[PDB]
Amino acid sequence: LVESGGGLVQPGGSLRLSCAASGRTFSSYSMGWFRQAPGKEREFVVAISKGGYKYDAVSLEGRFTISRDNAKNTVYLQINSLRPEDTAVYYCASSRAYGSSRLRLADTYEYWGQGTLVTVSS
């Protein structure tokens, strides 16, 4: 898995990240985004099931949405209304698990990318 799109962005703007997977088995995985902000433990961000259904983090205020394009082996994270506290390394992960509350847990996932840094600053 390879995440892309990180950079320096102004508060209030939006940013789209993507993650591309190798191989032929992309459609067989649910995909989840997590982040590691400086000085914090890993946080679940948002996930998408094999069928395309969104699973939101229990406290991230709806600002993070997700889509997948199976023909391109790619999943997308859209962050709206960026805040300084969104500064973090963002990771995407794959799991064979079906859509359920387990998609909000890191241990459910089998493969992880190397991450992409998002910095939000005025």
Author numbering: 5 to 126
Task: Share the article's original sentences.
By rationally engineering the surface residues of a model anti‐VEGF nanobody, we obtained a series of anti‐VEGF nanobodies with identical protein structures and VEGF binding affinities, while drastically different crystallization propensities and crystal lattice structures. Here, we successfully changed the crystal lattice arrangement of therapeutic nanobody (termed mNb‐WT) by rational mutations of surface residues, which remarkably reduced the dissolution rate of protein molecules from the crystal into the solvent. In summary, our findings demonstrated that the protein crystalline form can be modulated by rational surface mutation without impairing pharmaceutical efficacy.
Water molecules mediate a strong hydrogen bond network to stabilize two protein molecules inside the asymmetric unit (interface a). In addition to sulfate ions, water still played an essential role in contributing to protein packing in the crystal lattice to various degrees at the contact interfaces among the asymmetric units, such as interface b. Because of the small size and compact structure, mNb‐WT proteins were tightly arranged in the P1 lattice, and the Matthews coefficient was 1.76 Å3/Da, corresponding to ~30% solvent content.
